Amino acid sequence: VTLMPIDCELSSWSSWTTCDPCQKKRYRYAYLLQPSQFHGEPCNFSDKEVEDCVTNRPCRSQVRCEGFVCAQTGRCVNRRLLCNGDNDCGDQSDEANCRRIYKKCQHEMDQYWGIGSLASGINLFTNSFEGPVLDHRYYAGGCSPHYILNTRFRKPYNVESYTPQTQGKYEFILKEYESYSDFERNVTEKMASKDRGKHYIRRTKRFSHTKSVFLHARSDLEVAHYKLKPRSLMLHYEFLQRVKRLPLEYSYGEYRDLFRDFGTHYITEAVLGGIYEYTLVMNKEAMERGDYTLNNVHARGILNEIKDRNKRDTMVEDLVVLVRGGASEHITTLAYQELPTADLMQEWGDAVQYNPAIIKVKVEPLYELVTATDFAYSSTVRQNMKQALEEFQKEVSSCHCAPCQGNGVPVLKGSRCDCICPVGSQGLACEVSYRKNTPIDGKWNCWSNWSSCSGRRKTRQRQCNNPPPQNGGSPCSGPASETLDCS
Amino acid sequence: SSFIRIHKVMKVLNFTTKAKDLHLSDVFLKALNHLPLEYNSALYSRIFDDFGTHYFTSGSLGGVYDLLYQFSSEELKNSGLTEEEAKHCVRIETTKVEHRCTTNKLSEKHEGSFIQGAEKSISLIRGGRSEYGAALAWEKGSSGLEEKTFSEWLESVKENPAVIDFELAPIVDLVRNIPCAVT
Amino acid sequence: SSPVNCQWDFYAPWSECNGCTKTQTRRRSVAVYGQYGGQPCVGNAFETQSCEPTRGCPTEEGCGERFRCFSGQCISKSLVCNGDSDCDEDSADEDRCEDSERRPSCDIDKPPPNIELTGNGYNELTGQFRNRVINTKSFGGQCRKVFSGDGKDFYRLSGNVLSYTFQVKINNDFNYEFYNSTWSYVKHTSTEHTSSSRKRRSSSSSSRSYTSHTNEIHKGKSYQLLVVENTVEVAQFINNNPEFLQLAEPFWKELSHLPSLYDYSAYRRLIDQYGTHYLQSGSLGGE
Amino acid sequence: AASGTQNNVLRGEPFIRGGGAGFISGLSYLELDNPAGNKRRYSAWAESVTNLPQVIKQKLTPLYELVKEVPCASVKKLYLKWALEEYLDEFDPCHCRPCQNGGLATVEGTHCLCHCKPYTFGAACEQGVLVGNQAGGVDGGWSCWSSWSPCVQGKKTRSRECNNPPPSGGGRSCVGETTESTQCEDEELEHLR
Amino acid sequence: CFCDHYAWTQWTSCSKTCNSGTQSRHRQIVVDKYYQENFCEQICSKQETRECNWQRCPINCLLGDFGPWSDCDPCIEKQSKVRSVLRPSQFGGQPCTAPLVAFQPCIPSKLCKIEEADCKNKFRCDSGRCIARKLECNGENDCGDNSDERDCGRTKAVCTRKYNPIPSVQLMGNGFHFLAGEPRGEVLDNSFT
Ligand SMILES: *[C@@H]1O[C@H](CO)[C@@H](O)[C@H](O)[C@@H]1O
Ligand SMILES: *[C@H]1O[C@H](CO)[C@@H](O)[C@H](O)[C@@H]1O
Ligand SMILES: *[C@H]1O[C@H](CO)[C@@H](O)[C@H](O)[C@@H]1O
Ligand SMILES: *[C@@H]1O[C@@H](C)[C@@H](O)[C@@H](O)[C@@H]1O
Ligand SMILES: [Ca+2]
């Protein structure tokens, strides 16, 4: 193996912030200067440090509640939500000491299938879901019935619509090629006289046969459309509290650890369903050489005869199958190497309805949740969170990773980077393969910092993995340099 | 080439509306109560855009099937064989002697085929229930009616008709027993 | 063709000053739209700054004799304790009513099978449906039952909708076109000689063959199929005119928060959520 | 010397809207032996669409017509009307130098994407080949409206040039009137104030 | 003859942009011993011809300029402005696109002369419909509002079994728009018993 294992390096510490007026604390942090890769040391030694202070400054942190303050969670429920026979506080506190219970839901009701997943934030730069940011177990007044098929559902307060938009693309290509060539060239020669004589032969073949198959099947099934309300969202307890812990002063660390727990954005609108994708590539070759000769001479005489015969064959085949959404038996029977029968497809699509994946998303950045009805100093938290979001996007984008071999895709998983391999190579760098060459796709290096003013510039070099090596593939798809106005 | 067109119109039901004392739709009675007492062309025109101009005094509730099927096929075939030969011999002498002959020959053969076809179908169904109407509309139509599929569709039409023909009176004859009706 | 990278124009003059937010916004047009895979315009089509407004922020007006729902929408006092959630979003009309004062508003509680999709918005330029604009389930204190027959089930209509009907129409179109072609060719050629002579004793003789032969075979096949098939299952929904339509709560809430001046950055964020149009009528089914 | 080749390409793109997700994934699954789709699966889909339909034909009213029952409703209605005209002017495909091979274009915010017709591909739709019936030539694409003339004699006017691309090689001309005219905005300013 | 021995030439661009042109393709025939012997002159077709651009020429909409604002309605507090279609669009020409009727708020200048129902012996539902007095406490919802059944003793004998309505019975109570050729809205209540 050509490897050197590379250790993670965090920076030297920031200077401390001055002590916060309302957290009574101070903060310091490091930037990841190099991610751990190829089995270097696991690092993650605490990326933030925090200390207490004496406080010499005023604070106004109590945003009041015309509602009822829930005993454990601190949520402000509207006073009409008490004694409805339902948990609106998160920890049941709204339903204590009620002289009667006034149910609105006359009937039993389901939550829409998977509606809680969409209540959590996404780290948009890795498409990973993170912690809960919205409370889809909160209904306010609720209890207007919705039906998908014959099942009745209760709409969450935060959800503007969840509805069964229901669509299916299937796409199929089967491309096949065959090419064969045969060459033969025979010869015979003779002489005699009354003494002398000669006889000679040559016979030959060259042959080749070649075949290729590319097959690609994709089903994009959609089974629901989701949109969140644009305003007045009831947030989740665990997020609401970490946002209340954020400093008024800008420390990057304490805002970064919000993103590492609850992500960077929230899902405002989404397309729900399943992907089935199958793609087969096969290449096949056969090759031959034959060469035969005799030479015979007489006057006393001599004979020589030779035969040479060669056959070569190869086949190489790669298949990838990818399934999203559904139930585990349908998932595995589609995961299997052989194209489905329509019965499995039917049962998979039927199960995708009850456990959809997310096909398409409209985000909003997470600071758009930090509204003054829930948080004091909200505008300074927003402005901090905006700046942290730009700095964090420059940390968690995988451009920092060293290049994989074998066309591996590097993904920065934490403070550590994993080369996800294509089919047909193994080992931590994707080095272990039988293949003489495989197309390297070009990989971008990280984008250089904003220079000067009157229109700043940023630059990129396609250098992190240079595109051409070992019969290279496509050079990178994005803007190779970029500019934006001070004002 | 073959072509087949089918059109069938079926009348599973047939109704007449009363001449007097009809009970009006809630959404219609609301719009009639809302109209201004003085004439306005825009506001009264909007009734026709929302409720139309006339009501069915009688009609036939029905199912309709329409099919066109159209087929074209073409074939071309070719075969050929050929041979040609010529031979030329000579002798010359005077002792000296020479005798000689030479020949040239050819053959060719050919075969060819070309088959070409087009099929089209167009079908409409009105009335029935979507599973059986689907089953009937899906018939490519090469043999005309499949009486099993058609009779399952007609049994659907009895449960869910579409309008086929009608007789009309104007919507303005209905506007009765609202406030300021005559106006 | 070459890639064309997108370019911004210069910033426009500002819009009148927003009373409620105490700001002004200015626009910036795209001068060159990016084309043929060229780079898109980075940054924003707008910017906004603080301002002292001459024009003040407008107030709500109250529901007066009507019942105020918690959203700020108003509904008739006949709908309070109807036994239906007659305020959109979170009902309040149903709050803390007595078991003797509640009554069955209707036999059944089930709408036609995707009536919510009929109250969506539509974008004419992308052709996509957009989020909920009409409240399609305001029952208006009425038990408006229809028997269907495409599915053999009663359903309850909203009081607003002009007509909803389950007559089916199915339209199918099939086109299949194929050709198959095959050619085969063979040629053979042969040429020959012999000669013999004697002179006086001496003699000689010779002979030859030459031959060449060729075959070709060729085929082309094509088949294309197109099928276009449509089903309608609710061959008409006809929504009411705007006077009798009831808006969706989060659409009415976004309308309430429109700035009451021509800041296109506010109205674009409505159009991007709720589209350019609403569905006046149409057919539900499948394709 | 002897040589031969084969190429075979088989493509198919079933698309369905409406019906239950299992019936959709069953019907859209391509039987290469019956590529139109099977009578049974297709009838099952046609059953399920009675319970999970989508809107497939529609008549449209402009979104400004719904502005009701809010503060400033009358004024917000006219400003939503003008914002619709500004949005239409931002996303109208006239901003895109049109695609080859019959492709339409869409404005992707700041950007033009071609919607290449079947089995033709690439950024300009220059690559591949078309399928089905074609009229030939290049059909006439509009350039965007010229900026509105300032209410001379109480009416605005504007003109569009039909030159993007010009109808060429026998293709059909641009569809629509080359010019427009409308009443001015004094009704908003005076009456609503 | 293997007539495919001569070329798949490209079809020449359609003679008309609209209203049923035609287009043709001709074989790249070279006459030779093959053409002569294989019956090519007798049974090949030398040039093909077919319809193109069958769609009728698109007719765009032209609207008139708006009329005056109408005499203001004292019970609606609006005034109305109308315009007329000079020619409708058809055959795929541009739609009228702008609104054909417009409304503006008004300060009215008259009272309302509308009258209450006061409907003799009949029963006034909550929606104001004066239903027959025989339907008070009848046990079926005959007001639609249920207001005929708001409070009652032993209700009168409803028809004994459950029975369904006639198939598609509400189509018998939709109104029909003769100029457009289609149903528009529920006009008669064919759920009334
Ligand atoms: C923050 O950082 C310095 C580093 O020298 C500390 O010594 C000190 O506590 C300061 O507040
Ligand atoms: C530009 O964006 C901010 C401005 O300071 C920093 O993250 C850095 O300067 C970047 O290049
Ligand atoms: C003219 O017409 C449309 C709207 O009618 C505009 O949106 C388009 O940009 C063009 O200027
Ligand atoms: C083709 O298009 C129209 C618009 C005119 O240019 C005529 O040449 C013909 O109909
Ligand atoms: Ca509660």
From Swiss-Prot, chain A:
The highest taxon in the source lineage is Eukaryota
Q: Which GO terms describe its biological process?
A: complement activation; complement activation, alternative pathway; complement activation, classical pathway; immune response; killing of cells of another organism; positive regulation of immune response
EGF-like domain: from which residue to which, for each copy? 401-431
List all disulphide bridges recorded for this chain.
C8-C43, C19-C53, C22-C59, C65-C76, C70-C89, C83-C98, C105-C143, C399-C446, C401-C417, C404-C419, C421-C430, C453-C486
GO terms for CC? extracellular exosome; extracellular region; extracellular space; extracellular vesicle; membrane; membrane attack complex; plasma membrane
InterPro entries xref list: C8A_B_C6_EGF-like, LDL_receptor-like_sf, LDLR_class-A_CS, LDrepeatLR_classA_rpt, MAC_perforin, MACPF, MACPF_CS, TSP1_rpt
Q: Where is the TSP type-1 domain?
A: 7-60, 441-487
Q: Which residues carry this modification: Phosphothreonine?
A: T314
Glycosylation, residue list: W13, W16, N44, N186, W447, W450
Question: Which residues are listed for Ca(2+) binding in this entry?
Answer: L81, N84, D86, D88, D94, E95
What PTM annotation applies here? N-glycosylated; contains one or two bound glycans. Not O-glycosylated.
Where located?
Answer: Secreted; Target cell membrane
According to Swiss-Prot or TrEMBL, what is its membrane topology?
Answer: Multi-pass membrane protein
Q: What positions does the domain LDL-receptor class A occupy? A: 63-100
Instruction: Tell whether Cell division is among the UniProt keywords.
Output: no
UniProt main location, coarse: secreted
Notes on activation and inhibition: Membrane attack complex (MAC) assembly is inhibited by CD59, thereby protecting self-cells from damage during complement activation. CD59 acts by binding to the beta-haipins of C8 (C8A and C8B), forming an intermolecular beta-sheet that prevents incorporation of the multiple copies of C9 required for complete formation of the osmolytic pore. MAC assembly is also inhibited by clusterin (CLU) chaperones that inhibit polymerization of C9.
Q: Which UniProt keywords apply?
A: Complement alternate pathway, Complement pathway, Cytolysis, Disulfide bond, EGF-like domain, Glycoprotein, Immunity, Innate immunity, Membrane, Membrane attack complex, Phosphoprotein, Repeat, Secreted, Signal, Target cell membrane, Target membrane, Transmembrane, Transmembrane beta strand
Name the family: Belongs to the complement C6/C7/C8/C9 family.
Protein's recorded name: Complement component C8 beta chain
The gene for this chain is C8B
UniProtKB/Swiss-Prot annotation, chain C:
Post-translational modifications reported in the UniProt record: C-, N- and O-glycosylated. O-glycosylated with core 1 or possibly core 8 glycans.
Domain (TSP type-1): residue spans on this chain:
5-58
Q: Where is the composition biased (Acidic residues)?
A: 86-98
Q: Where is the composition biased (Basic and acidic residues)?
A: 99-110
Which parts of the sequence belong to the LDL-receptor class A domain? 61-99
Glycosylated residues, chain numbering: W14, N180
Feature: compositional bias, Low complexity? 201-209
**Where does the protein end up?**
Secreted; Target cell membrane
The SS bond pairs are C6-C41, C17-C51, C20-C57, C63-C74, C69-C87, C81-C97, C106-C143
**Which residue stretches belong to region Disordered?**
86-121, 197-215
Q: How does it assemble?
A: Monomer or dimer; as a C5b-7 complex it can also form multimeric rosettes. Component of the membrane attack complex (MAC), composed of complement C5b, C6, C7, C8A, C8B, C8G and multiple copies of the pore-forming subunit C9.
Q: Which disease is it linked to?
A: Complement component 7 deficiency: A rare defect of the complement classical pathway associated with susceptibility to severe recurrent infections, predominantly by Neisseria gonorrhoeae or Neisseria meningitidis.
General function of this protein? Component of the membrane attack complex (MAC), a multiprotein complex activated by the complement cascade, which inserts into a target cell membrane and forms a pore, leading to target cell membrane rupture and cell lysis. The MAC is initiated by proteolytic cleavage of C5 into complement C5b in response to the classical, alternative, lectin and GZMK complement pathways. The complement pathways consist in a cascade of proteins that leads to phagocytosis and breakdown of pathogens and signaling that strengthens the adaptive immune system. C7 serves as a membrane anchor.
Q: Which family does it belong to?
A: Belongs to the complement C6/C7/C8/C9 family.
What's the protein name? Complement component C7
Native source species: Homo sapiens
User: From which lineage does this chain's organism come?
Assistant: Eukaryota, Metazoa, Chordata, Craniata, Vertebrata
Which part of the entire protein is covered? 23 to 312 of 843
Curated annotation (Swiss-Prot), chain E:
The answer to keyword Transmembrane applying to this record is yes
Q: What Gene Ontology terms for biological process does this UniProt record contain? A: complement activation; complement activation, classical pathway; in utero embryonic development; innate immune response; killing of cells of another organism; positive regulation of immune response
Residues listed as glycosylation sites in the UniProt record: W8, W11, T17, W69
Q: How is it modified after translation?
A: All cysteine residues are assumed to be cross-linked to one another. Individual modules containing an even number of conserved cysteine residues are supposed to have disulfide linkages only within the same module.
Taxonomic source organism: Homo sapiens (Human)
Give the shown range, full length included. Answer: 22 to 214 of 934
Q: Where is the LDL-receptor class A domain?
A: 117-154
Q: Which UniProt keywords apply?
A: Complement pathway, Cytolysis, Disulfide bond, EGF-like domain, Glycoprotein, Immunity, Innate immunity, Membrane, Membrane attack complex, Repeat, Secreted, Signal, Sushi, Target cell membrane, Target membrane, Transmembrane, Transmembrane beta strand
Q: Domain TSP type-1: where?
A: 1-58, 60-113
Binding-site residues for Ca(2+), renumbered to this chain: L135, N138, E140, D142, D148, E149
Oligomeric form and interacting partners: Component of the membrane attack complex (MAC), composed of complement C5b, C6, C7, C8A, C8B, C8G and multiple copies of the pore-forming subunit C9.
**Which residue pairs form cystines in this protein?**
C1-C40, C3-C44, C14-C52, C18-C57, C61-C96, C72-C106, C75-C112, C119-C130, C125-C143, C137-C152
Its job:
Component of the membrane attack complex (MAC), a multiprotein complex activated by the complement cascade, which inserts into a target cell membrane and forms a pore, leading to target cell membrane rupture and cell lysis. The MAC is initiated by proteolytic cleavage of C5 into complement C5b in response to the classical, alternative, lectin and GZMK complement pathways. The complement pathways consist in a cascade of proteins that leads to phagocytosis and breakdown of pathogens and signaling that strengthens the adaptive immune system.
**Location within or outside the cell:** Secreted; Target cell membrane
A cellular-component GO term for this protein: membrane attack complex
According to its UniProt record, which protein family does this protein belong to?
A: Belongs to the complement C6/C7/C8/C9 family.
